[PDB]
Amino acid sequence: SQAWQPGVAMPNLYKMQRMLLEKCDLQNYGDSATLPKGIMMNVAKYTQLCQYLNTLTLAVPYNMRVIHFGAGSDKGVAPGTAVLRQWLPTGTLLVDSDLNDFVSDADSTLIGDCATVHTANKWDLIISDMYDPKTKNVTKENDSKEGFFTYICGFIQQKLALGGSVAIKITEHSWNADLYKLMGHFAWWTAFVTNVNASSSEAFLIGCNYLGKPREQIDGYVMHANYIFWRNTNPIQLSSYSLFDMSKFPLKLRGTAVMSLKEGQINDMILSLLSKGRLIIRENNRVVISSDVLVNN
Amino acid sequence: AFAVDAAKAYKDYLASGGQPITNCVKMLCTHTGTGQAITVTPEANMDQESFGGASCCLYCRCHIDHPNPKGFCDLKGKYVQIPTTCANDPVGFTLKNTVCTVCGMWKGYGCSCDQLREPMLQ
Ligand SMILES: Nc1ncnc2c1ncn2[C@@H]1O[C@H](C[C@@H](N)CC[C@H](N)C(=O)O)[C@@H](O)[C@H]1O
Ligand code: NA
Ligand code: NA
Ligand SMILES: [Zn+2]
Ligand SMILES: [Zn+2]
């Protein structure tokens, strides 16, 4: 049924529950979907994420600015970055970053901890696939994680243009209470599970149209428990079916308006335009980025 | 005067039975594209595979300078169409082949600029 969709978004009713946290036990665990010949899992995963993002009210201005965190791989290449560049309009600026060196199709690549990444500019879309290797290796009470997630929360609150959107990868153990709270700072949000990786607790927390303020107060600990309850009670069938029809894959270049308004000029009319993906608020200055280099003997 | 020749080294490595560079990023596409060699988005036809450009570039993959004054790369940030019969070694294919500056198709794998003039068609 939902097997022909790119994946499944968490139904809104789960966001209004007050579930107690417990282990994520997936019925369809261990299974795997049929990947098309020679296609890497991450190409399939990003393709389904992008297929789902196409159904949302993403702002797509000319000269769109996209930053991709956790773009490297043990292979030394950037599969997700290749998909994002395929998906995004040709005139989009794409910057990627990772702790380890890698070869990328992005306009610029920064190597090092995301905590070392600096930018004087605001972004229109933030994609993160960052995942700490120790999250698997070492077992721990499932509390909110504060490594790269603290950086992402700060980056969203200071470098995301109003109207901008995010897709941040989380898992049962790789999550952050403050990031769930920030989902309430968007016109709409969801947890999206790709059908090709439905056997994993992985999901992309998608914030659609940033408002720079909370439209809803969200308790992150309760919302992650709500997310796990959904994963434990609504099994998602593994499926690669959406990967075989790429005819409507490219993100449509909407040419969304970009304006540099003051924090005092943000009225209810502006919030309404931001909420429909019809407006991006940020300056349009030289896109400048850098990665700190620790100096030592 | 000394200069490392990575192209020659990879070709000799392949001729000696060396395993071709792996993990070239193959993209999902309709396979109803123009079939041109290097494009801004996947353009594979029914007889080609589209790959992320940087992953199919010997210089990018080996982390060595590009052989030209500006050190510019013609694959990075683009998509390279590789004949399915050669998709097992995209890095070797881009090295051993040349893009026609006229039609944008690979010479010997799509470029028809040198075929005898066709009788005009209504
Ligand atoms: N603090 C951090 N800063 C930057 N990158 C990180 C950090 N922690 C983990 N990562 C990266 O997160 C990545 C997780 C990978 N699964 C990403 C796969 C990649 N998205 C792909 O397209 O294949 C690893 O390459 C890590 O190096
Ligand atoms: Na594109
Ligand atoms: Na660095
Ligand atoms: Zn290159
Ligand atoms: Zn030609």
Numbering used by the authors:
A (entry chain A): 6800 to 7096
B (entry chain B): 4271 to 4392
What does the article say, verbatim?
To facilitate structure-based drug design, we conducted an X-ray crystallographic study of the SARS-CoV-2 nsp16-nsp10 2′-O-methyltransferase complex, which methylates Cap-0 viral mRNAs to improve viral protein translation and to avoid host immune detection. Nsp16 is a 7-methylguanine-triphosphate-adenosine (m7GpppA)-specific, SAM-dependent 2′-O-MTase that is activated upon binding to nsp10 (16, 19). However, the main known function of nsp10 is the stabilization of the SAM binding pockets of nsp16 and nsp14 (19). The 2’-O-methylation of coronavirus RNA that is mediated by the nsp16-nsp10 heterodimer is essential for preventing recognition by the host to evade immune responses that are triggered by viral mRNAs.
